[model samples]
Target: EPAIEAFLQDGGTLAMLNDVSTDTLEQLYTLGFNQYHAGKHDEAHKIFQALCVLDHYEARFFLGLGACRQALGQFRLAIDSYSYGAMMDLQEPRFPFHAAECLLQLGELEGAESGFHSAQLLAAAKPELAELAARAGIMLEVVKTKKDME
Candidate 1:
């Protein structure tokens, strides 16, 4: 825990720690997070799912889950994972922001629009949240309209 705390304090750089433990619970989580940072979303999802099965999961795990699903073109299920993650931890913006995008991709126009609106409202007090919310909202709008004419 100290390592993670220090790492976060040091701007959350992976290079800050040479060893995240190869055979530990934290390693599993860190591996998944690393895969995510590397854009290896599918690999990250497997690790996150393993963590979930072990009952050692967190909101970020589901973020990986949703990310993999989204990357694999399973937007509907991706939204489900993100929504579940959001319910697990409201402070984590991963789920809401990502799920909103998933909704947009799935072409659930009404759902995407409403979700973005809700996300923006919730993000009002958190700048990071607001930024992601805006991203999702903008992408959702652009994508939905582009497909509508097709």
Candidate 2:
């Protein structure tokens, strides 16, 4: 547990990275994603959870876990995973985009509004994520409409 603590304290890159190996971590991540892609949320969540624990530096693991958690209706836990991924990769639109969806499911329109805005800004900056920005744009409109009704 102390070694795991060290990995976390070091911003996910200080110690314990040498043993598990890197590409293997990537391969393992594929397994997690495939599980989610196949609609096995529970299986995918467990794999992603293990992946995050073994190596905290992989942003993909966080996203996969978030996706599974979201699908499983664990909104708060999904938000936590998305938050971690967002911090790791500040320009990644998927994090806030997915998290905003979770917030919307919870009817946290105010937070969802901000989350979608953040995704829009970051996605605009990253051209490859233009679709992400578009999706966030749609969600932001939905959130606004819901807020008006409230």
Candidate 3:
């Protein structure tokens, strides 16, 4: 657990970084994004959580939490986290798509469909959201069929 503690301490350092220039925050966010992409969920979570405390961009941490939870198969929690992130900025499709995936996994077809729809609506504004929307649409159909069978 020492590693966790150390990571937390380093994350605290980021809070003091709130006053740093936008360029600095951008650099740090890039690092955090890369860590997540590399599958370092815990590390990415720590960084994102730290950034969250700084008030510069806390929603990204919520997004990261949703993503990490989804990756770890904690579906309901992932949707909750993603919902919080999406509320902060619904324009970002990642949150809705992540939420949709969680709902689909739980056999909540209606919720999954809504999430997929939301992702689709937001995708045009944020091109990066397209992939999530596409996956969400497929998942929506699967969950709907599975729920019907049940």
Question: Which candidate number has the best lDDT?
Answer: 2
lDDT of each: 0.70, 0.88, 0.74
Better of 1 and 2 by TM-score: 2
Alpha-carbon runs more than 4 Å astray in model 1: 1-23, 128-130, 136-150
Q: Whole-model lDDT, candidate 2? A: 0.88
Report the Cα lDDT for residue 74, model 3.
Answer: 80
In candidate 2, stretches whose alpha carbon ends up further than 4 angstroms from where it belongs are 1-8, 11-18
Residue range 1-150, candidate 1, lDDT tens digits: 997998667655342244333357577878888887888877877887776555423666677777878887889888988888788787665566667677767667667766665666567657756677677567657756865876
Tell me the tens digit of each residue's lDDT in model 2 across 1-150. Answer: 998787677676532555767777778888988889999999999999988888676788899989999999999999999999888888788899989999999999999999998999988887877887898888899999999999
Specify the highest-TM-score model's number: 2
lDDT of 3 by residue, 1-150 (tens): 787578556654344444566576667778878988999977876776656655434678688777877877889888888888887886888788778878878877888878877777787566665676677667667766876887
TM-score of 2: 0.88
Residue 131 CA error for candidate 3 (Å)? 4.9
lDDT of 1: 0.70
For every model shown, the clashing-pair count is: 0, 0, 0
Comparing 1 and 3 on lDDT, the stronger one: 3
Q: Return the lDDT, model 3, position 97.
A: 75
Every model's TM-score: 0.68, 0.88, 0.71
| List of clashing residue pairs for candidate 2 | none
Angstrom error of the Cα, residue 120, model 3: value is: 2.2
